[PDB]
Design an enzyme around this catalytic site. Structure first.
Site, PDB file in Angstrom:
ATOM      1  N   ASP A 115       0.830  -1.205   0.000  1.00  0.00           N
ATOM      2  CA  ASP A 115       0.000   0.000   0.000  1.00  0.00           C
ATOM      3  C   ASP A 115       0.867   1.259   0.000  1.00  0.00           C
ATOM      4  O   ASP A 115       1.335   1.705   1.054  1.00  0.00           O
ATOM      5  CB  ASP A 115      -0.942  -0.016   1.197  1.00  0.00           C
ATOM      6  CG  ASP A 115      -2.001   1.058   1.112  1.00  0.00           C
ATOM      7  OD1 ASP A 115      -1.909   1.901   0.193  1.00  0.00           O
ATOM      8  OD2 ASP A 115      -2.932   1.054   1.944  1.00  0.00           O
ATOM      9  N   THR A 116       1.040   1.857  -1.183  1.00  0.00           N
ATOM     10  CA  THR A 116       1.789   3.104  -1.301  1.00  0.00           C
ATOM     11  C   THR A 116       1.073   4.279  -0.653  1.00  0.00           C
ATOM     12  O   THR A 116       1.697   5.323  -0.436  1.00  0.00           O
ATOM     13  CB  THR A 116       2.058   3.426  -2.773  1.00  0.00           C
ATOM     14  OG1 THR A 116       0.816   3.609  -3.467  1.00  0.00           O
ATOM     15  CG2 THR A 116       2.842   2.308  -3.428  1.00  0.00           C
ATOM     16  N   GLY A 117      -0.217   4.148  -0.356  1.00  0.00           N
ATOM     17  CA  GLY A 117      -0.957   5.204   0.297  1.00  0.00           C
ATOM     18  C   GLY A 117      -0.900   5.184   1.807  1.00  0.00           C
ATOM     19  O   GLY A 117      -1.511   6.040   2.452  1.00  0.00           O
TER      20      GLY A 117
HETATM   21  C1  LIG Z   1      -5.449   8.821   3.963  1.00  0.00           C
HETATM   22  C2  LIG Z   1      -5.051   8.068   2.714  1.00  0.00           C
HETATM   23  C3  LIG Z   1      -5.492   6.608   2.768  1.00  0.00           C
HETATM   24  C4  LIG Z   1      -7.022   6.503   2.897  1.00  0.00           C
HETATM   25  C5  LIG Z   1      -4.801   5.907   3.939  1.00  0.00           C
HETATM   26  N1  LIG Z   1      -5.160   4.444   3.982  1.00  0.00           N
HETATM   27  C6  LIG Z   1      -4.414   3.513   3.091  1.00  0.00           C
HETATM   28  C7  LIG Z   1      -5.310   3.199   1.887  1.00  0.00           C
HETATM   29  O1  LIG Z   1      -4.585   2.505   0.912  1.00  0.00           O
HETATM   30  C8  LIG Z   1      -6.520   2.346   2.331  1.00  0.00           C
HETATM   31  C9  LIG Z   1      -6.070   0.950   2.771  1.00  0.00           C
HETATM   32  C10 LIG Z   1      -7.342   0.125   3.042  1.00  0.00           C
HETATM   33  C11 LIG Z   1      -8.162   0.366   4.360  1.00  0.00           C
HETATM   34  C12 LIG Z   1      -9.429  -0.443   4.624  1.00  0.00           C
HETATM   35  C13 LIG Z   1      -9.899  -1.500   3.594  1.00  0.00           C
HETATM   36  C14 LIG Z   1      -9.079  -1.736   2.284  1.00  0.00           C
HETATM   37  C15 LIG Z   1      -7.809  -0.917   2.014  1.00  0.00           C
HETATM   38  N2  LIG Z   1      -7.382   2.187   1.208  1.00  0.00           N
HETATM   39  C16 LIG Z   1      -8.721   2.819   1.147  1.00  0.00           C
HETATM   40  O2  LIG Z   1      -9.184   3.436   2.053  1.00  0.00           O
HETATM   41  O3  LIG Z   1      -9.429   2.616  -0.122  1.00  0.00           O
HETATM   42  C17 LIG Z   1     -10.833   2.918  -0.169  1.00  0.00           C
HETATM   43  C18 LIG Z   1     -11.084   3.558  -1.659  1.00  0.00           C
HETATM   44  O4  LIG Z   1     -10.918   2.509  -2.461  1.00  0.00           O
HETATM   45  C19 LIG Z   1     -11.546   1.342  -1.673  1.00  0.00           C
HETATM   46  O5  LIG Z   1     -10.816   0.319  -1.717  1.00  0.00           O
HETATM   47  C20 LIG Z   1     -10.349  -0.060  -0.189  1.00  0.00           C
HETATM   48  C21 LIG Z   1     -11.045   0.680   0.637  1.00  0.00           C
HETATM   49  C22 LIG Z   1     -11.581   1.843  -0.167  1.00  0.00           C
HETATM   50  S1  LIG Z   1      -5.580   3.835   5.559  1.00  0.00           S
HETATM   51  O6  LIG Z   1      -5.750   2.379   5.559  1.00  0.00           O
HETATM   52  O7  LIG Z   1      -6.870   4.377   6.032  1.00  0.00           O
HETATM   53  C23 LIG Z   1      -4.193   4.388   6.610  1.00  0.00           C
HETATM   54  C24 LIG Z   1      -4.358   5.673   7.401  1.00  0.00           C
HETATM   55  C25 LIG Z   1      -3.195   6.174   8.271  1.00  0.00           C
HETATM   56  C26 LIG Z   1      -1.881   5.353   8.314  1.00  0.00           C
HETATM   57  C27 LIG Z   1      -0.731   5.871   9.175  1.00  0.00           C
HETATM   58  O8  LIG Z   1       0.462   5.655   8.470  1.00  0.00           O
HETATM   59  C28 LIG Z   1      -0.712   5.151  10.488  1.00  0.00           C
HETATM   60  O9  LIG Z   1       0.379   5.605  11.231  1.00  0.00           O
HETATM   61  C29 LIG Z   1      -1.710   4.075   7.513  1.00  0.00           C
HETATM   62  C30 LIG Z   1      -2.876   3.574   6.633  1.00  0.00           C
END
Ligand SMILES: CC[C@H](C)CN(C[C@@H](O)[C@H](Cc1ccccc1)NC(=O)O[C@H]1CO[C@H]2OCC[C@H]21)S(=O)(=O)c1ccc([C@H](O)CO)cc1
Lengths: 99, 99
Positions: B25-27
């Site tokens: 996860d690059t995000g």
């Molecule tokens: C803020 C930018 C990102 C939202 C940040 N996230 C990474 C994302 O990649 C996240 C991973 C994911 C979460 C839940 C289910 C599946 C994938 N994907 C996600 O939300 O995708 C959405 C849209 O597409 C759909 O597919 C999957 C879900 C829907 S996170 O997990 O919330 C996070 C927050 C803070 C930290 C700090 O580093 C801690 O210290 C680390 C990680």
């Protein structure tokens, strides 16, 4: 380009004629942008993340240019903490992970 | 290898003597793993994403193998719906985005 990951993979995007910064997010299925005005029709939708579910507006077949690469796909608009570019568009620009 | 993004970039990881599937996860700045009872001290943390925040336990200097590539760093353990390999470890395995 080749993008290392010692910093957030942030890039400039063009959508609706406006420039914005967005995060390239391989862990996101979908593209979610912060609240903004976009031309066209939309449909109410739900999306779940690490903290639960939120309501978004779904815009289909939207033009969006990512770091100089053109894509046309679905863009979700709602209370996301950060503008994220998800796999639905990363595939269109030919983005892969490599190690 | 090269991982395309048509589907979720899931890979097998080894942590705490257990094998698990996790997202590259690059995000994600940091690594977030499903609830598991690791030994040693930890510090409380709250992390936020789509939907809001979850409470996690921060463990430091944890050994983790990702596709046979060894890494060591911080891992956050909590009620995440998916195991997330973040940039703190992706850099250690030489992972890049390319398009
Ligand atoms: C803020 C930018 C990102 C939202 C940040 N996230 C990474 C994302 O990649 C996240 C991973 C994911 C979460 C839940 C289910 C599946 C994938 N994907 C996600 O939300 O995708 C959405 C849209 O597409 C759909 O597919 C999957 C879900 C829907 S996170 O997990 O919330 C996070 C927050 C803070 C930290 C700090 O580093 C801690 O210290 C680390 C990680």
């Amino acid at each position: 380009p080749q993008i290392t990951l010692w910093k957030r993979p942030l890039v400039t995007i063009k959508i609706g004629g406006q420039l914005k910064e967005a995060l390239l997010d391989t862990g996101a299925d979908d593209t979610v942008l912060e609240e903004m005005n976009l031309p066209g029709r939309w449909k109410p939708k739900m999306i779940g993340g690490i903290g639960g579910f939120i309501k978004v507006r779904q815009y289909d077949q939207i033009l969006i240019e990512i770091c100089g690469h053109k894509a046309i796909g679905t863009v979700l608009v709602g209370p996301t903490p950060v503008n994220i570019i998800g796999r639905n568009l990363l595939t269109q620009i030919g983005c892969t992970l490599n190690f």
